[PDB]
């Protein structure tokens, strides 16, 4: 009787811990996905910003050359 | 004489996703509370 | 006697696992908050950068028009 | 003749928070170590 | 006999839960490290972008002054 | 008369790390599956 109680409580606890482990795995997977997506977003933003600043640098350099020619 | 326009690379497409794991946090707290119903009282 | 030992060890383990589950939930909540805040920060930065590059584009376009008028 | 100044939108307010869950990681490792004191030795 | 079965199953479950807790701690530590590194990256990017936009602002202001002097 | 070049601060060094905790997620799911082998059947 006490052994049946111990076994039933243990099986209940193991089921609840299995649920908790599946929930933790799901949450960690979602966090990994979102963190990696935002890392890729930051890298893409840095690349596009480097390109845009290169373009801005070139255009202002041409403009400074034109101003030098004028004055 | 003319002047070519300057079109900078549009970056508005870069979007940062959001995470929603509130279901899982709620389930974890719920299990941490329900495990008191699994304690043995001989 | 052995049943009391089993029950006591099981209750101790269940208490420790409850502590671990609360700790995991707290850590996951903090990670979610910080990840979402940095995502919002990246989005705000992208919006402000789009606005700033629009302004820069307009100003350099006006400047190129002025240079064209001069030369 | 004049020239209007160009004031770009200040973005210095955009700050990225940091996470500190080291207490929770330490507690998890501590419990994973202390669970050896809950093993049954009949 | 049943007590030995209960004790063996409990010890097995406690070992598996110890493994799961170590795995969760490792994953949370890695997530913390990566999230903090990307936060530092976003902050460094914001600082460098503020500097670059200050430089761009100064250069276009000088250029607008030059254009005003010319015309 | 001359014109000093304008060199903007290079930001290409700013890189965002990636996280790989797939081993740990796989281990968590594996343990959540293997805990069925620890159930007591008197």
Author numbering:
A (entry chain C), C (entry chain B), E (entry chain A): 918 to 988
B (entry chain E), D (entry chain D), F (entry chain F): 1159 to 1200
What does the paper say about this structure?
Most of the hydrophobic residues of HR2 are involved in hydrophobic interactions with HR1, with only one exception—V1176, which is completely solvent-exposed. We observed various effects on neighboring residues for the D936Y, S940F, V1176F, A942S, and the Omicron triple mutant. These structural effects correlate with changes in fusion activities for these mutants —the D936Y and S940F mutations result in a loss of a salt bridge along with a decrease in fusion activity, the V1176F mutation on HR2 slightly displaces Q957 on HR1 along with a decrease in fusion activity, and the A942S mutation introduces an additional hydrogen bond along with an increase in fusion activity. The fusion activities of the D936Y, L938F, and V1176F mutations are ∼60% of that of wild type, while the fusion activity of the S940F mutant is ∼25% of that of wild type. Overall, none of the five single and the Omicron triple mutations dramatically altered the architecture of the HR1HR2 bundle, as indicated by the small RMSDs between the wild-type and the mutant structures.
Two heptad repeat regions, HR1 and HR2, distant from each other in the prefusion S, drive membrane fusion by assembly into a six-helix bundle. This HR1HR2 bundle formation is thought to provide the energy for membrane fusion and is therefore a target for therapeutics, as exemplified by peptide inhibitors that disrupt infection by the HIV-1 (19, 20), SARS-CoV, MERS-CoV, SARS-CoV-2 (23–25), human parainfluenza virus 3 (26), and respiratory syncytial virus.
